[PDB]
């Protein structure tokens, strides 16, 4: 017997619970007997607990002298049988000592929600002060067995720290002392279970991160029952069920590279709901979208272009090339506007232009291109291989090749000529020509030497004059030699060279030269070639040469003075 029933002194019309528990091996089946055999009655009642191991005897309302007996608690297993006894005395109210316990305030009908605490009141008085006991659904309550959740207070009440459905019942408080026992009126405690389907306190939050790249997705969900929180990627779960948290569940992702979605799954017996946060890995930009030309100049193009991107963009990169002379690509980095002027171009050329955008991940693809042409300019160069001969004794035919650097559609040429070249060229005789590469002029004085110089022009303006060619109006004699070049062969030698003559049959060439400015004029005649090597000269000194051709009719015009020096 781990509990033994005490003798009780009770009140008429009151209650009297006798407690009797046993133990051992085998486990017993207890009983309650009066005078040997269990002569049962209406007002008496047994409430067996722990599978008939211990059992309370309850009597109510108490009557005197009917109920005043010694009662036997039987206890037996396969091996052993021992009784224990207890007496009941039952007094009327009018014959109670002054000190007999009295319930000043018993418990009240109480309602409370699960896990929240419940303080069941009981206040008594007597001499000596009575120790309080509680019965719930006719069974005594033991604060020890509750894990310190339930506890009796000196002041009187019984405290339930965390409510549970099981804590519901009729409650009776009982004031016990040397005089005897007194019960309170019963009072129910209800423990209501509010049914609330789940919702999210904090939703799972979408993010944009860099590649690797790490983010904690928090997800909080509340309700009643308080819902479990796990993570899913599509159809598969990620959090396990060994220690799956409730209410909260953070997902710490690390080293992310692919943009993936994630579902938080709030779940309980009442219902399931879900919310999806999408992690996105910031990507490269998109093509800025075809640029457009605003201005042009001889040397510049300037353009504007749409961002082409929903997110902002660190800067832009222009790439371009001359379509005219394919290649190479030119770059302009670190452009921080949607407007740019590409300068340092060459006039009258057309360029294909693209645009790319850069963000913190890198540089995106390029736009579609825009082809466009730079404006015109005056030519940077003169007509080439300018030539002249006589058709008659008084008219001259001149021709030339168009200049390598026209900077524009060539609108014509202009031809300056005279036989007093020491004047400025602007004073010379001059007239215009069309884009053709050849003209004539007459009204020339017979047996003379005219010098001729030619320039090209465009809508914009004049180019440079060619270098002076000159022609003698005597006919039959050959023309002035072409592009006479002189270059140093050795420390005592110079190699003269010139372009092959046109049609005219030259008998011999006539060469004249001298040392520096003030040296003796040497003369040499030789058979027709395009080059001649001058031998036996002085080291590191300068010589001046000029050349003319001879035909049967006579001596042609001389070149201008060409100068070159021997090695040194
Ligand atoms: C995520 O949680 C981990 C662990 O508490 C912490 O070390 C880390 O700093 C957190 N990162 C972010 C971005 O919240
Ligand atoms: C995730 O789902 C959203 C729903 O709008 C969709 O827009 C997005 O493209 C999806 N992303 C992935 C990685 O499946």
Author numbering: 35 to 602
Give the exact sentences the study uses for this entry.
Previous mutagenesis and structural studies have demonstrated that the proteoglycan-binding site lies on Ig1 of RPTPσ, and comprises an extended positively charged surface of basic residues101314.
We reveal that the multi-domain extracellular region of RPTPσ is unexpectedly flexible. We determined the 3.15 Å crystal structure of a six N-terminal domain human RPTPσ construct (termed Ig1-FN3), which contains all the binding sites for synaptic ligands identified to date. This construct maintains the V-shaped Ig1–2 arrangement previously reported, followed by an extended conformation of the sequential domains Ig3, FN1 and FN2. Since no substantial Ig3-FN1, FN1–FN2 or FN2–FN3 inter-domain interfaces are apparent, we hypothesized that when released from crystal packing constraints each of the Ig2-FN3 region linkers may provide substantial flexibility. To test this, single-particle negative-stain electron microscopy (EM) class averages of human RPTPσ Ig1-FN3 were calculated. These showed a broad range of conformations. To control for the potential risk of artefacts associated with negative staining, we also performed small-angle X-ray scattering (SAXS) measurements, at a physiological pH (7.4), for both human RPTPσ Ig1-FN3 and sEcto. This analysis further supports the observation that both proteins are flexible and are likely to adopt multiple conformations in solution. Taken together, crystallographic, EM and SAXS analyses demonstrate that the ectodomain of RPTPσ is able to explore a large conformational space.
